[PDB]
Structure 1
Amino acid sequence: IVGGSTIQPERVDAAALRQLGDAMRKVVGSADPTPLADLLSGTPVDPDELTREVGADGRQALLDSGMAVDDGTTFSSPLRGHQLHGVVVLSDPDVEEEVQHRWYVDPLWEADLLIRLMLRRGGARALDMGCGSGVLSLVLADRYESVLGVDVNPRAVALSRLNAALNGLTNVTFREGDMFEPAEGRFSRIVFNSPTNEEGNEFVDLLEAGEPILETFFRNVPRKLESGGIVEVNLAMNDYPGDPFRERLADWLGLTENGLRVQIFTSQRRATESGGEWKRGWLVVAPGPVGLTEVEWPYHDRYRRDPDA
């Protein structure tokens, strides 16, 4: 079972964690792997080689934080390292559904793609709903005065805090709780890699929570969004005969009454028995003329071709 390991960033001082993050930046994803990179790839490593790379302080920080365990003659990690978009990120390894713990954390299935879709603006306060590993909060940190990540998964909150500390971030904080309950005030930026995929209307688990998590999200967006702000959502969308997703969405958002502008970029789609349709896409609220517009943009295909678009 993968996804239940204990993660305790509070056991390591800020400087040591930043130093481990600097060490990860040097080697994670590099062509010449080092013991630290091997460790964060799932390979057991010789602790003496590790000590020479990250120091005795660093070695102990790996243990104290839960980034590594001493198996006896080797160190191993339950987590996997990533370097993307100027940040380093730990998350769970990508593993089949049947072996995931209740508190398994999105192993960055779509994060790299989603960061490339995100608008380059900045502002005052940003909110990452369902922050998971924290990855999207990390990239927002440069251009928002404050970034708040929220998750109902307490292990995600700890891992997000660890990742913020690895990257040396000061303005990124995380809170455990249910949707907007821990997010006070208004935000100029809200991002949400939503836990929706093939489950339709019914909650399965924290990574496939059902259409009701989108309903809660969009019903509360207007009272949580600063005027002229931006909302960005990765979501699965189910169209049923006579009952398209976009109509329920407009109702949740109060879209016309609030004068919001919304665009849905549909990338993937699968026709369903009934002639309805399943879609995966990217939903944006941004300043513009009131209304909802739907466009086809196969950004998954383009991304597989060449990410730099």
Structure 2
Amino acid sequence: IVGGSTIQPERVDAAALRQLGDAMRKVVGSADPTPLADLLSGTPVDPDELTREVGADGRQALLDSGMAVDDGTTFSSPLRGHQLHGVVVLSDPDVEEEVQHRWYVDPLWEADLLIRLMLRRGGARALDMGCGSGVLSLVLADRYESVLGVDVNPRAVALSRLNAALNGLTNVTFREGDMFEPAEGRFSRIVFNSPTNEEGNEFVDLLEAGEPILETFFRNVPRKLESGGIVEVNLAMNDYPGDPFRERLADWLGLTENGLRVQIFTSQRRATESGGEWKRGWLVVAPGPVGLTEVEWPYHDRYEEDPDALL
């Protein structure tokens, strides 16, 4: 079972983590793999060779944080390292649904894609709902005065704190809780890589939590959003006969009465035997004329061709 490892970033001092993060950044994804890169690829490594790379303190920090485990003759890691969009990120390896622990963290299934979709503006307060590994928080860090990540998974929170510290990000904070409960005040930016996929209405687990998690999210968005602010959501949507997702969404948001503008960019579609349709897409709330617009934009298709073409 994968996703139950103990993660304790508070056990390493801030400078030491940041230095580790710098060491990771120069080797993870390098064409010339070092012990550190091997470690973060899931390969057992010689601790002595590791020690030559990150020093004795770096070695101990790996252990104390839970980033490495002493097998006996080797170190290995339960985590996998990634470098993207200027940050390093550790998360769980990508594994089949049946072997995922309750507290398994999104292995970056879509994050790299979503960051390419994200608007480039900055502002005062940003909120990353269901922050997981923390990845979307990390890239918001340099253009927002503060970033808050929330997750109900306590291991995700620990992992996000770790990743923020690896990247030296002072203005990035994480709270454990249920949706908006720990998120005080309003935010100029709210991002949500929602735990919705194939489960429809029903809760399966923390990564497929059902449509009610979207209803909770959008019902509360207007009271958590700074006017003029921006909301971005990766989500699965179900259209049923006489019951399209977009009309449930408009109701949750109080779209007309609040005068909000919503754009849904639908990338993937699959008709269902109901006569309905499953969709995956990208939803944006942003200033503009009141209303909801849905356009078909195969950005997954584009991303497969050239990721840089969503730039």
Q: Do they superpose with TM above 0.5? A: yes
Measure how far apart 1:117 and its partner are: 0.1
Partner Cα separation in structure 2 for residue 19 and residue 142 of structure 1: 18
1:159 maps to: 159
Partner Cα separation in structure 1 for residue 214 and residue 29 of structure 2: 34
Measure how far apart 1:55 and its partner are: 0.3
Measure how far apart 1:274 and its partner are: 1.7
Partner Cα separation in structure 2 for residue 224 and residue 70 of structure 1: 44
Provide Cα deviations, 1:107-143, integer angstroms capped at 9, x if missing partner.
Answer: 0000000000000000000000000000000000000
Partner Cα separation in structure 1 for residue 202 and residue 96 of structure 2: 21
Measure how far apart 1:95 and its partner are: 0.2
Measure how far apart 1:222 and its partner are: 0.3
Partner Cα separation in structure 2 for residue 89 and residue 200 of structure 1: 30
Provide Cα deviations, 1:226-251, integer angstroms capped at 9, x if missing partner.
Answer: 00100000000000000000000000
Please state whether the residue corresponding to 1:160 is helix, strand or coil.
helix
Please state whether the residue corresponding to 1:16 is helix, strand or coil.
helix
Report matched runs for 1:97-112 at 5 Å. 97-112=97-112
Partner Cα separation in structure 2 for residue 259 and residue 29 of structure 1: 45
Please state whether the residue corresponding to 1:308 is helix, strand or coil.
helix
Provide Cα deviations, 1:158-204, integer angstroms capped at 9, x if missing partner.
Answer: 00000000000000000000000000000000000000000000000
Provide Cα deviations, 1:22-77, integer angstroms capped at 9, x if missing partner.
Answer: 00000000100000000000000000000000000000000000000010000000
1:260 maps to: 260
Provide Cα deviations, 1:261-285, integer angstroms capped at 9, x if missing partner.
Answer: 0000000011000210000000000
Partner Cα separation in structure 2 for residue 107 and residue 297 of structure 1: 25
2:236 maps to: 236
Partner Cα separation in structure 2 for residue 118 and residue 27 of structure 1: 27
Partner Cα separation in structure 2 for residue 249 and residue 291 of structure 1: 12
Please state whether the residue corresponding to 1:94 is helix, strand or coil.
coil
Partner Cα separation in structure 1 for residue 133 and residue 114 of structure 2: 14
Please state whether the residue corresponding to 1:270 is helix, strand or coil.
strand
TM-score under structure 1 length normalisation: 1.00
Where does the alignment leave 5 or more consecutive residues of structure 1 unmatched?
none
Partner Cα separation in structure 1 for residue 28 and residue 301 of structure 2: 26
Please state whether the residue corresponding to 1:300 is helix, strand or coil.
helix
Please state whether the residue corresponding to 1:257 is helix, strand or coil.
helix
Alignment RMSD (CA, Å): 0.3
1:172 maps to: 172
Please state whether the residue corresponding to 1:170 is helix, strand or coil.
coil
Please state whether the residue corresponding to 2:284 is helix, strand or coil.
strand
Measure how far apart 1:14 and its partner are: 0.3
Please state whether the residue corresponding to 1:205 is helix, strand or coil.
coil
Please state whether the residue corresponding to 2:256 is helix, strand or coil.
coil
Please state whether the residue corresponding to 1:38 is helix, strand or coil.
helix
Measure how far apart 1:295 and its partner are: 0.2
Please state whether the residue corresponding to 2:258 is helix, strand or coil.
coil
Please state whether the residue corresponding to 1:165 is helix, strand or coil.
helix
TM-score under structure 2 length normalisation: 0.99
2:19 maps to: 19
2:203 maps to: 203
For this pair of structures, how many residues does the alignment match?
A: 309
Partner Cα separation in structure 2 for residue 168 and residue 187 of structure 1: 23
Partner Cα separation in structure 2 for residue 241 and residue 50 of structure 1: 59
